[PDB]
Amino acid sequence: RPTFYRQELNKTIWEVPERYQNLSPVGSGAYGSVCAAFDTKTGLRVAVKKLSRPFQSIIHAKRTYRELRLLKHMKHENVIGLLDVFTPARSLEEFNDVYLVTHLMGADLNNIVKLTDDHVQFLIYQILRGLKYIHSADIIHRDLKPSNLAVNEDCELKILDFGVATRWYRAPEIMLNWMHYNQTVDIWSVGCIMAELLTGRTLFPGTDHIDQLKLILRLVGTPGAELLKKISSESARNYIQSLTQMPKMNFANVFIGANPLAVDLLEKMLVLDSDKRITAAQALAHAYFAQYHDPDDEPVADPYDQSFESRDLLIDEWKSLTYDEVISFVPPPL
């Protein structure tokens, strides 16, 4: 039970172990505030997030428990991982604040831009490697986009969720609930990201859900008979057939002058039918990534138990489950 010190910044009490020194605000919003800090135990530079009113409602409490469970399980080089979690509460009774600690990321993908073909290969490779890992434990990101990707000076990437319109990167089946989905909603997003790096521009910059679909269908074409057969909703089916029939464009006439193996991968990623879309694992083995792919260093995750998600609990039960998870936390080795 280490020594805590208090201090105020951004109009909020921070109460942290002495281990963590020199705190400096880096951004706050509805969900939590974040500080950079020096970690006197590893000489490393870290980021500390104070959750905003984590047990105010049933939604907040369950969400707080979800983030903590998730970060405790993720142990992979291309995925954010949990260095430490603490509370200044001595007991469950007085337990009201949660703090999460991770490696301090510098600049996101949004900030670091066009760019070389070798750079795109390496950046997209690392995202897929990280996606193979989380998808293997049935975890879906759902909000993959450049501002959720951290990239340091070595060009090393990590997937995270700081919590660019999201809709610009969203799979059309999730955006509209028009057809069932799987893990490959995130594969759609990656294709939108890769295109952007290849050409310097947002691929599909829609101004609402309808305009977004319009732009997308302009590129991939209206759904064929095969895909139209699996659209569950009657409304959605009508809309689509009531549109004016757009053809599939030739991707080489769109990504003009780009590396042909990347044009090919883009075509396997940006397919409308989600039964046909390439997975993370299959995509690691494509010829675009020949210089990086090693099937013996692209690991999968331990089984992840997410049954809690179907439960309807009271606030005090989620709060108590969170506290347990704080107490059983064992740090990762140096």
Ligand SMILES: COc1cc2ncnc(Nc3cc(NC(=O)c4ccnc(N5CCOCC5)c4)ccc3C)c2cc1OCCN1CCCC1
């Ligand atoms: C310099 O600005 C920084 C740096 C940071 N470094 C490290 N961590 C953080 N933020 C952070 C995030 C989290 N949680 C998650 O990342 C999270 C939650 C849920 N799910 C995931 N997954 C889903 C599947 O894939 C794995 C990821 C991740 C926990 C603790 C911390 C500390 C930051 C934050 C940061 O700045 C934030 C504000 N800033 C203002 C300028 C732009 C953004």
